[PDB]
Symmetry: C3
Subunit: 455 residues, 3 copies
Amino acid sequence: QNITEEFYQSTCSAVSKGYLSALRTGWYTSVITIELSNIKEPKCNGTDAKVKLIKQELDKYKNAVTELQLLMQSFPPFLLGVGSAIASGVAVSKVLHLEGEVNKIKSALLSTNKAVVSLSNGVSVLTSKVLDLKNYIDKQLLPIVNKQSCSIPPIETVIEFQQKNNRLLEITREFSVNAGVTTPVSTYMLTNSELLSLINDMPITNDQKKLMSNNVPIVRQQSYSIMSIIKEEVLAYVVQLPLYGVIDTPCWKLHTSPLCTTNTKEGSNICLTRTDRGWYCDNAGSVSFFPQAETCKVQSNRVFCDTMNSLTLPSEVNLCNVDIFNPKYDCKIMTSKTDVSSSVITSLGAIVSCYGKTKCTASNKNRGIIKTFSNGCDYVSNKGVDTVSVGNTLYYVNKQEGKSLYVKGEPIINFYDPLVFPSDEFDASISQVNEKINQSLAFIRKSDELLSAIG
Amino acid sequence: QNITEEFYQSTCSAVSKGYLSALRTGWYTSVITIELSNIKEPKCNGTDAKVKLIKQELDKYKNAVTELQLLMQSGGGFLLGVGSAIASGVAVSKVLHLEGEVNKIKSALLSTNKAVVSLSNGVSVLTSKVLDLKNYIDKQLLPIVNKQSCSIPPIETVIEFQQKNNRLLEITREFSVNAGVTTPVSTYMLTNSELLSLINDMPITNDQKKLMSNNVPIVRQQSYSIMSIIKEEVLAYVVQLPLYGVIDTPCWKLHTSPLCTTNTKEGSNICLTRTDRGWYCDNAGSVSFFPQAETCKVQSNRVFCDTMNSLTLPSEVNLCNVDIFNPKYDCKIMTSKTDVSSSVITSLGAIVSCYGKTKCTASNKNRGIIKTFSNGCDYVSNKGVDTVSVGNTLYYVNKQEGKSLYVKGEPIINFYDPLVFPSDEFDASISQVNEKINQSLAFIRKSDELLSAIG
Amino acid sequence: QNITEEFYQSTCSAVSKGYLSALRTGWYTSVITIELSNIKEPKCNGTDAKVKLIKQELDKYKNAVTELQLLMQFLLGVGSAIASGVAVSKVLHLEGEVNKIKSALLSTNKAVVSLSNGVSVLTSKVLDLKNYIDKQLLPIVNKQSCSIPPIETVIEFQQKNNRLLEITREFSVNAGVTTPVSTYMLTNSELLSLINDMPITNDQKKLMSNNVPIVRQQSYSIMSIIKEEVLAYVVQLPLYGVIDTPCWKLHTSPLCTTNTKEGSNICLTRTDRGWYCDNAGSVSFFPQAETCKVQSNRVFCDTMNSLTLPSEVNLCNVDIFNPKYDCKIMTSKTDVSSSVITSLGAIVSCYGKTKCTASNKNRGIIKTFSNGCDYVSNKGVDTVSVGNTLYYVNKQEGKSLYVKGEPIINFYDPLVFPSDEFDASISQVNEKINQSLAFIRKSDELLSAIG
């Protein structure tokens, strides 16, 4: 629980260290079943308010089944087709459509509400009966309506059927706007207790059960619900849960801000910005890099990421933070003439790139302005700092305990000649810039020697 | 229909064929109404627990009307153009605001729950009345709260009122967290029974009707629900359904991956990627091109694409898949020295671009690693392949049945000279690069020929 | 409430004026509390169908509390949107902090608390399950015989307990941070009262009260703490520090030459599209559509995704070649047709053999576009069609002004024209043109010195 940050004045960037990894490398799929009733629109003569209420709820139930069947055949079209995040769960969904595969699971859950079932294609899956509308309707609602004249229901039955039928009605809702594939997995799909018991039974280490059971909200966001089948008066859908094959390896976050020359005026400055910003995690002797901000979820020390949305880099990518001119790795930069002030709120600090006439401050709740940034790239930690202002933009600062280190260094943009500086580099590196520098240096050579005997 | 795939080894790209178009070409707008009672706060002195329950629900109802009164408005509006998706629906919504227009649909719906109404701007909309709280509240509920006597209602009345009031509360909730515009359109806005009837009354062909009725989730995802008015005891919101004016025309999806040289040097390679990846659909003698995958939704072999984010290309854009050096169409490519390994999952295969020191493999569930990729661009079909692994990332291949064709050919990056190669073209083409090869080729010769006569 | 729009034929761009600003510049943080009961799992034996229903509902209550014990806690800059709210959420986890709010709300439902760091925060109690369960429910479950409850008590408990369950559900699928803020988090009456009690101007209160739907979309709810029979979450409302200043929106479309030989054309595009609003003598610029919401002529934008520009930036709309500001453009050779639906019109850039059309629903085609960049107002036009795409135009009411002028791409020699600038400016392309003219002159001089 020790977060530390280093600000590199040399490159206008900061790295937040001390995080712990949880990287999704596998999937666990489970079959979730709901038992339905095979009851027809009741032919019974009666018109009390209570039986009116029961018939209304029955028509809700009957329509939910029908509109779930329209989701089936429209293999369901939404299983055959697109997917890599879902292929594992889609694989189990297709198998349930084989001859008697439903009856396999139906038998295992006849006597118990949770059982392990071996499937015909060679997968072993935990299967759960989360709701039984078959026995409630057949034993408490069939005797009332499967006659010529309907006997009155108790008010207790009217209330409790509404409660039971509600989960099915909600599942049909989520499954008829999401086309049968949803993420995060809702509580109507799998409650907190059901997901906790399912984690408890998974073929994983006891420490993985610790991590998953403590971060259920994150597990929800990295899980999928895949709709499978209605048949044999059963409702089956597949829940696809993450398997974290990488745990407790170091992770760090890179924050980058533009670095520009200052002492010149107007539109005559050279700028460069480190590009490889995002999360990094040590993974199997290499570095997993997650460039898009959404894919990694943070809870206290832990960074939860999905390896499917990652690039794999050598360990030497970190040498960019220690020495951007190191030989071993070609550190990535971008360049431009854009001389614009901005700020980046780091894990426990703030980078300020103040340029031009912009007024850039950092302030405290009580003392007011406690720093006025000069032109150039600077940094301030969150110790006694609450907000940062750049122009007309007030940023609040993350208030999170940790140690912050200011690594003084010469801004590398000072080392470059502005006349031969490539200033349109969308995605370049240190070496690529040096190659273009020499080529323009060589053109200057070749042209100058063409004027020796002439001039 | 049978999905087929071709991989072109020369250009590091693949084309998935065999799909059927379903293109959003227009909009269909309908008005949904709920009849309300303008009941004032009860003022019945009685204190029975059932009267409290009725009173508490009336408060939930009366607050929903107030909250809908606060939402009385709709909205305000390969690099593409810019549209305004709900401009059609908002246009109908603005007309309903005008004085006397709400009274027009009140009269037309006096004797039926569905009618076509003429509004002031020639706007002629099918109108639906889907819930009548006015009858229930004014007849069943008003008398037992009207007096100061407070006729205590049966417990059925407490429950019955909650069920009727539920949909209005849920419609208000959806509008509240969406500024009056919701998408996808939920079954609270428009139930499956209601939506299917609306599809049956659109000005479309019978084949178009079946397509929507069997793709209700897609239709809902591409529809909008727009809060318009609450006045004259009427709540009215506009529903904006999609119009699929182009249907059953052939579509194909283009996948592209970087194509670089395999030289063993620290970044001394030239890369090249086709930039035209996306969905292509035949459309009225042209090709509609959708470069962003999130405008197109696939269901088996059906592609639902929104034309608002499309480009209109000549039929000859497909020639880039036969001969990229063809004269008729000028294929768009990008260049760089950015040389790194990635994998692209196609419809029934996987493209792998292995570069440098990365472990790029394809493996089978039971047989193990069945292919290790050499440096360069390669393809593997889904036949007998389950997973593709690049670095620390494991991709899953579609197990969808189909036939894929490997088209051998010399990689075209080899054709180009790595010294006169324009190697940072973000959005270029074959001609624009030959444009710049000829320039740098001619300039170098001139300076060499101009160095000759200096004797 | 007078929207107007001007089309500049010279630069293929349009400006929509007349809008009024509502800029989110800061945050207001408030604490919302639900008082809970330490009620423990009933261990009276009962079989009555109503006893089961009460027991089942206490189960949903108990599981909700357990679930909540786990839910605890142009290129722009980068912010931390919920930093202000999370900062207050952190303070609640200090000891005694829960009790100060518990003490300040012992006898009332709405009180100010100065937390351990001395910040005045408004706190509220929106639901009191502690009194209901302990008084109404505990006697009928806290014995052996399990007193039969009336059906009315079963229904009330479901109603009271429902809001707790639905708050739990929202936090559970969102990792304890929700946006927009739902009516379960904060009902309409509670939000309006909260607005009325904030330390803000009357104009700010009026602006927020008329735009509760937008305020919800710009607000956050942060799960903070549960302990000592109390549940607390932080609600982070927007501060509109800048109000009623004039805004305008800039629409741009590619401007190209119209030579009939394909591939022989040079193109130009203003890259400064987005919202502009006057702000403290400078101009706040919002280049993204997502960061700005519009209701009638009022524009709600979030300054976290804005650049601060000199007020001279507006000269680019009157004179793109003005000396006081370097207007940003981009160049290309791509001769492609597109359309831009402006506030009360549509810009059509029609190139090649493309079909470009403006139509009325009952009269049919009313304007047919030829090669170049043109503009049609929404007065009398319902749709604009470019190629295989049909756009409906906005039907907001306002007056368009068509400003005639020579397209500026007609002032550039295509040979020396730099047609690759992904980001550039008017000055920058004049540099590269001065340079290419200078080099080609130097080359010519060198063959004279050797001739």
